[PDB]
Design a protein around this ligand. Structure first.
Ligand code: U3P
Ligand code: ADN
Length: 119
C-alpha cells in the first residue's frame, strides 16, 4: 500500500509540448481503471514543495484546516480530460501556468498529502 505522501509525489511532482499530460498521466498511473479527470504537476524542487507545509495556513476545500498555500507562485501544468477522452483511451489538454498551490499536509514530519488547489 502506497502512503499518502508517496501518492502525492507520484501524482503531482515533476521537479524540472502539447502531449505532456497524455504521457505523464499514463506513466504516473492516473489512467488505470478510469481517466483521472483533472490533475496538476508541480515543477519546483521537492524541497520547495515540502516547504509549503510551513507556509500560509488556509482552509481546505473539504473544510479541514491542515492546508497551506505557497508563499510564491510556482511553475505548474494543469492536465484536464478532453471531451473526446474515453477510458481506456484517455486524452488530456496540457496548460502550463504559474500560480500559487494549496496542499494538505500530514504526518510527522508534516509533508504534502493532497493537492487541494492552485490559486
Ligand atoms: O487544481 C486542482 C484541483 C484539484 N486537483 C485534484 O482533483 C481531484 C479531485 O478534487 C483531487 O485528486 P484525488 O482524486 O487524488 O483526491 C485533486 O488532487 C488537482 O489536481 N488540481
Ligand atoms: N484536506 C485533506 N487532508 C488530507 N488528505 C486529504 C485532504 N483532502 C483529501 N485528502 C485525501 O488525500 C489522501 C491521499 O493519500 C487521502 O488519504 C485523503 O486524506
Amino acid at each position: 500500500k502506497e502512503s499518502a505522501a508517496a501518492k502525492f509525489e507520484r501524482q503531482h511532482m515533476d521537479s524540472g509540448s502539447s502531449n505532456y499530460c497524455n504521457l505523464m498521466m499514463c506513466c504516473r498511473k492516473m489512467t488505470q481503471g478510469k481517466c483521472k479527470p483533472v490533475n496538476t504537476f508541480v515543477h519546483e524542487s521537492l524541497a520547495d514543495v515540502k516547504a509549503v507545509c510551513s507556509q500560509k495556513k488556509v482552509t481546505c476545500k473539504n473544510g479541514q484546516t491542515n492546508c497551506y498555500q505557497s508563499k510564491s507562485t510556482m511553475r505548474i501544468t494543469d492536465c484536464r480530460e478532453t471531451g473526446s477522452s474515453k477510458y481506456p483511451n484517455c486524452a488530456y489538454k496540457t496548460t502550463q501556468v504559474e500560480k500559487h498551490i494549496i496542499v494538505a499536509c500530514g504526518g510527522k514530519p508534516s509533508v504534502p498529502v493532497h493537492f487541494d488547489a492552485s490559486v
